[PDB]
């Protein structure tokens, strides 16, 4: 079923009861490259992780970024306002509303 | 400025502008204060409110004056968003010393002296960082509830 | 590793640890330069291609020697993926040297059974091995030769299998020179039959 | 090239804790990753040593060395193919569904090859593995390539 895919010569091989048969030295070349690519691999799967790992660190020396501000400014308002006639008014009044 | 907050300022502008012409003059300020119970509202208080504007208080002059004083104003749902990220397990009000350390050590706006002023009218729980939610209420609408 | 238990003690002489393998197949290789070559004293030794005389070849050796030999005195070398291949006939390099060399390597590692197609090559240990081990006998019992490493009981069991599966008679042809040690095998095969179906 | 991306210089001012516009050689690995480059730690190590640069003794940096080292690492981004990442984990567990048992991926990511701390391994599984003990790596590798 696997060999179903690939832009490969569906000739060059042949199957049988315990194994596939394959011609040479190209496919041979392919594999080799492949071979190196796995030495990397885990290695390759590590990297992204590592990468990615720090990529979240930046967002943190980072996520928080705004939630603070929000908190920051938000308080300041109040400190200013709470002493304002109009705002006290709204306050006593805010309840009668619906 | 979200649009419902601008509609709340339009409703407050209509309750203070009792002549309904679109410009709050000093007579509107005095008659709104007298209808709230202020029989002794001095003319110097009305003149200090008008001295914060460069022109007549129409709806866009009232919005720009409130914008320039509320440049860090945050709605209650975004303050509770940030406090749910500070208490990510939900329900519990966060510790007093955790909010003092995280305000200081992250930002200059969270410096201590300011943290003593935060505890000072925002009471204990609020100040301490244990309760939560009452501080979001009084940051969007001041004074004791 | 996980699999091997049945043998356990024999294992090392049948198969290699899953990293010994790994450490061998996954290693640096330079095809275009690495090669096998003719050799006046030693039959075929390995080397690295240095230059190219247009139809002559100069090669370094593994021991340190330099020879300029014909183009066809030079033979490719299998990628490391084929280190101590159970079935040399799976190699992508069907040479004379590569065959000699495969046998040789898995012997220096004490593996006496290596397949070469249908054959079951067997090399005289000249010493004792836990292979004829009464644990092995079972292990090889009911296993196609692809489910287990190169060994004579493989042949011998499969025969049996095949015997009952296909309803055909079987044969085993043992052959070698005077000192190859066939009787030994023959006998050993025989015990096998007697045991597994008495 | 500039496309002169001057935001790499602005990010160097966010990683230099002294404000003198130099970044130590031990930070260069993690800052290449934060600029959108994933060189393996052995590669970052080799290059360094390759240039007779010792990461064992005190180091400083200048922007004039960090810029060309990021540009030498930027050619190696053609090694980041997601077909091989999902097929690696598809060969790591049986059956036709992409699930690693929790502790298999945690012990392999900490002890196989470039050692990732178990603190970082728990921070990379947090949310994608639920209480069944089965990590769906189709969505797990999707979210790892979202950063």
CB atoms A92 and B38 under 8 Å? no
- A80, A85, A86, A89 alpha-carbon torsion, rounded to 10°: 120
CB atoms A70 and B82 under 8 Å? yes
CA atoms within 13 Å, Cβ hemisphere of A81: 28
The CA distance from B85 to B79, in Å, is 10
What's the token pair of residue D50? 């390759």
CB atoms D145 and A52 under 8 Å? yes
Residue D36: closest CA among A55, A19, C119, C187 = A55
How distant is the Cα of A92 from the closest Cα of chain D, in angstroms? 45
CA distances D141 to A16, A41, B27, Å, are 36, 15, 67
CB atoms A35 and C29 under 8 Å? yes
Residues of C in contact with A31 (CB under 8 A): 79, 81
CB atoms A75 and B118 under 8 Å? yes
Provide φ and ψ at C38, rounded to 5°.
Answer: -65, 160
Provide φ and ψ at D100, rounded to 5°.
Answer: -90, 135
Check residue A19 and give left, alpha or beta (phi > 0: left; psi -120 to 50: alpha).
Answer: beta
The CA distance from B39 to B55, in Å, is 27
What residues of B are designated binding site for Ca(2+)? 17, 19, 21, 28
The CA distance from A35 to C97, in Å, is 24
**Residue-wise DSSP of chain D:** -----THHHHHHHHH-TTSSS---TTTHHHHHHTTT----HHHHHHHHHTTT--SSS-----HHHHHHHHHHHGGGGGG--HHHHHHHHHSSS-SSS-EEEHHHHHHHHHHSSS---HHHHHHHHBTTB-TTSEEEHHHHHHHHT--
Asked if B78 and B66 count as a contact pair (C-beta separation under 8 A), the reply is: no
CB atoms A46 and D109 under 8 Å? yes
**Is any Cβ of chain C less than 8 angstroms from the Cβ of A33?**
no
- Round to the nearest angstrom and report the end-to-end CA distance of chain D: 24
Task: Please enumerate, as own/partner, the contacts of C22-31 that have beta carbons within 8 Å and a separation of 24 or more.
Answer: C24/C80, C24/C83, C24/C84, C25/A35, C25/C80, C25/C81, C25/C83, C26/A35, C26/A38, C26/A39, C26/C80, C27/C80, C29/A32, C29/A35, C29/C79, C29/C80, C31/A29, C31/A32, C31/C76, C31/C77, C31/C79
The CA distance from A84 to A91, in Å, is 10
Residues closing a segment before a gap in chain A (C–N exceeding 2.5 Å): none
- Comparing alpha-carbon positions, the chain A residue that sits nearest to D119 is A53
Asked if C89 and C145 count as a contact pair (C-beta separation under 8 A), the reply is: no
Q: Apex CA B29: angle with CA B24 and CA B30, to 5°?
A: 140
Provide φ and ψ at D78, rounded to 5°.
Answer: -80, -5
What's the token pair of residue A53? 């790992």
Query: Quick one: CA dihedral A43, A45, A51, A54, positive or negative?
Result: negative
Q: Give me the residues paired with residue D54 across strands.
A: none
What residues of B are designated binding site? 17, 19, 21, 28
What's the token pair of residue D134? 């089965």
Residues found in chain C: 198
How distant is the Cα of A64 from the closest Cα of chain C, in angstroms? 46
Instruction: List CB contacts of C52: < 8 A, sequence separation 6 or more.
Output: C58
Edge-to-edge strand ranges of the sheet holding C44-52: C67-70, C56-59, C44-52, C34-38, C74-76
Asked if B59 and B12 count as a contact pair (C-beta separation under 8 A), the reply is: no
CB atoms B138 and A78 under 8 Å? yes
- At A13 the three-state DSSP class reads strand
In terms of Cβ atoms closer than 10 Å to its own Cβ (0-12, 13-18, 19+), residue D137 is: buried
The CA distance from B2 to A90, in Å, is 19
* Buried residues in B102-137 as b, exposed as e (16+ CB within 10 A): bbeeeeebbeeeebeebbeebeeebbbbebbeebbe
Instruction: List CB contacts of D121: < 8 A, sequence separation 6 or more.
Output: D105, D106, D109, D110
The CA distance from A88 to A28, in Å, is 83
Residues of A in contact with C29 (CB under 8 A): 32, 35
What's the token pair of residue B67? 């914008």
- Comparing alpha-carbon positions, the chain C residue that sits nearest to A34 is C26
Q: Apex CA C117: angle with CA C114 and CA C119, to 5°?
A: 60
Instruction: List CB contacts of C51: < 8 A, sequence separation 6 or more.
Output: C57, C58
β-bridge pairing A13-16 and A19-22: antiparallel
**Is any Cβ of chain D less than 8 angstroms from the Cβ of A51?**
yes
Of C26, C92, C145, the CB nearest to A24: C92
Task: Name the method of structure determination.
Answer: cryo-EM
Mind spelling out the 3-state secondary structure of A14-58? EEECCEEEECCHHHHHHHHHHHHHHHCCHHHHHHHHHHHHHHHHH
The CA distance from B142 to C141, in Å, is 86
**Is any Cβ of chain A less than 8 angstroms from the Cβ of B51?**
no
The CA distance from C147 to C158, in Å, is 11
Q: Which helix (H) or strand (E) holds B133?
A: none
Q: Give me the residues paired with residue A13 across strands.
A: A22
- At C46 the three-state DSSP class reads strand
| Chains C and A touch, using 3 or more CB pairs below 8 Å | yes
CB atoms D38 and A51 under 8 Å? yes
The CA distance from A73 to C112, in Å, is 81
Q: Which helix (H) or strand (E) holds B89?
A: none
What's the token pair of residue B81? 């968003």
**Residue-wise DSSP of C103-147:** HHHTTTTT--EEE-SS-EEE---SS--GGG-TTHHHHTTT--TTS
Residue C20: closest CA among C77, C83, C62, C102 = C83
In terms of Cβ atoms closer than 10 Å to its own Cβ (0-12, 13-18, 19+), residue C178 is: exposed
Of D14, D41, D144, the CB nearest to A48: D144
CB atoms B74 and A64 under 8 Å? no
Asked if C110 and C12 count as a contact pair (C-beta separation under 8 A), the reply is: yes
CA atoms within 13 Å, Cβ hemisphere of D24: 10
Distance of CA C116 to the CA centre of its chain: 7
The CA distance from D66 to D31, in Å, is 10
The CA distance from C81 to A29, in Å, is 12
The CA distance from A57 to A68, in Å, is 17
Around Cβ A3, how many Cβ atoms within 10 Å?
10
Chains that touch D (3 or more CB pairs under 8 A): A
Around Cβ C72, how many Cβ atoms within 10 Å?
9
Chains that touch C (3 or more CB pairs under 8 A): A
Q: Give me the residues paired with residue C103 across strands.
A: none
Instruction: List CB contacts of C23: < 8 A, sequence separation 6 or more.
Output: none
Distance of CA D49 to the CA centre of its chain: 19
Strand residue runs (E) in chain B? none
């Amino acid at each position: 079923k696997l060999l179903g895919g690939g832009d490969v010569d569906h000739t060059q091989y042949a199957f049988g009861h315990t194994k596939v048969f394959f011609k040479a030295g190209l496919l041979g070349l392919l594999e080799e490259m492949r071979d190196d690519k796995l030495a990397e691999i885990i290695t390759a799967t590590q990297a992204r992780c590592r990468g990615f790992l720090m990529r979240v660190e930046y967002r943190a020396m980072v996520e928080r970024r705004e939630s603070i501000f929000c908190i920051q400014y938000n308080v300041r308002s109040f400190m200013n306002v709470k002493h304002w006639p109009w705002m006290k008014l709204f306050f006593k009044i805010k309840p009668l509303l619906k | 400025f979200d649009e419902t907050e601008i509609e709340d300022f339009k409703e407050a502008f209509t309750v203070i502008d009792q002549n309904a012409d679109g410009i709050i003059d000093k007579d509107d300020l005095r008659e709104t204060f007298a209808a709230m119970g202020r029989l002794n509202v001095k003319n110097e208080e009305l003149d200090a409110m008008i001295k914060e504007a460069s022109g007549p208080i129409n709806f866009t002059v009232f919005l720009t004056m409130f914008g320039e004083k509320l440049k860090g104003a945050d709605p209650e749902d975004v303050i509770m968003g940030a406090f749910k990220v500070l208490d990510p397990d939900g329900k519990g009000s966060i510790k007093k010393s955790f909010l003092e350390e995280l305000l200081t050590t992250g930002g200059g706006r969270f410096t201590p002296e300011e943290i003593k002023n935060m505890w000072a009218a925002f009471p204990p729980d609020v100040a301490g960082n244990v309760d939560y939610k009452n501080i979001c209420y009084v940051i969007t609408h001041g004074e004791d509830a | 590793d996980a699999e091997m238990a049945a043998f356990g003690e024999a294992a090392p002489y049948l198969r290699k640890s899953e990293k010994e393998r790994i450490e061998a197949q996954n290693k640096p290789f330079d095809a275009k330069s690495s090669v096998f070559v003719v050799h006046p004293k030693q039959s075929f030794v390995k080397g690295t291609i240095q230059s190219k005389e247009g139809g002559k070849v100069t090669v370094k050796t593994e021991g340190g020697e330099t020879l300029t030999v014909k183009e066809d005195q030079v033979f490719s070398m299998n990628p490391p993926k084929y280190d101590k291949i159970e079935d040399m006939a799976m190699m992508t390099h069907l040479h004379e040297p590569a065959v000699l060399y495969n046998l040789k390597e898995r012997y220096a590692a004490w593996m006496i059974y290596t397949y070469s197609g249908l054959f079951c090559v067997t090399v005289n240990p000249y010493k004792w091995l836990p292979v004829y081990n009464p644990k092995v006998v079972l292990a090889y019992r009911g296993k196609k030769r692809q489910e287990a490493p190169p060994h004579i009981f493989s042949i011998s069991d499969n025969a049996y299998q095949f015997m009952l599966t296909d309803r055909e008679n079987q044969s085993i042809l043992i052959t070698g020179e005077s000192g190859a040690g066939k009787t030994v095998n023959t006998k050993r095969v025989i015990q096998y039959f007697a045991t597994i179906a008495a | 090239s500039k496309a002169a991306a001057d935001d790499f210089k602005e990010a160097f001012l966010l990683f230099d804790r002294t404000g003198d516009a130099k970044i130590t050689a031990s930070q260069v690995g993690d800052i290449a990753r934060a600029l959108g480059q994933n060189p393996t730690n052995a590669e970052i190590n080799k290059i360094l040593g390759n240039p007779s640069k010792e990461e064992m003794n005190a180091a400083a940096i200048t922007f004039e060395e960090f810029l060309p080292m990021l540009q030498a690492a930027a050619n190696n981004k053609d090694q980041g193919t997601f077909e091989d990442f999902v097929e690696g984990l598809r060969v790591f567990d049986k059956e036709g569904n992409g699930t690693v048992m929790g502790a298999e991926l945690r012990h392999v990511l900490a002890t196989l090859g470039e050692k990732m701390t178990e603190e970082e391994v728990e921070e990379l599984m947090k949310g994608q593995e639920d209480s069944n003990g089965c990590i769906n790596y189709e969505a797990f590798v999707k979210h790892i390539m979202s950063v």
